[PDB]
Amino acid sequence: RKRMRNRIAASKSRKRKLERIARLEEKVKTLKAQNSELASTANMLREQVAQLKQKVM
Amino acid sequence: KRRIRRERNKMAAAKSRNRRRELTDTLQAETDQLEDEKSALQTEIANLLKEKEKLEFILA
DNA sequence: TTCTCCTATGACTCATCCAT
DNA sequence: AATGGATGAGTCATAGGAGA
Fold first, then answer.
1. Distance B15 CA to D4 C1' (A)
2. Contact B45/A28, CB-based, under 8 Å?
């Protein structure tokens, strides 16, 4: 028993370490994308403001 | 044979555990950063927009 | 191409740290 | 003091890759 219960832990402990790794990999992926796109919209906007600041100046 | 390999494999078990600790430490720390970068672009965007409008009004 | 050897990695077990 | 889970670390079996 003592061994059998403990197996179950070691097993569960390995899995947690595995998942966190997965989850992170996933988060890194989506972040790269959203993070990259908002950058593009950020640029469409920076220039438009630059332009308008002039038209008003 | 064993005395050789056992210590030899001891190093591998160690080195592998080593990498997983670092892989995670890195991904974790990287996503923390990417999260911030994203977060700030969301505010950079919000402010750019307010400027955009403001200027369009000046051209009203 | 298939056969051989070696490292990397899962899964077990053990010792140890903390809380009940 | 006693019992139970978490996690590091050693061991084994075994797979997958580099090379004869």
1. 31
2. no
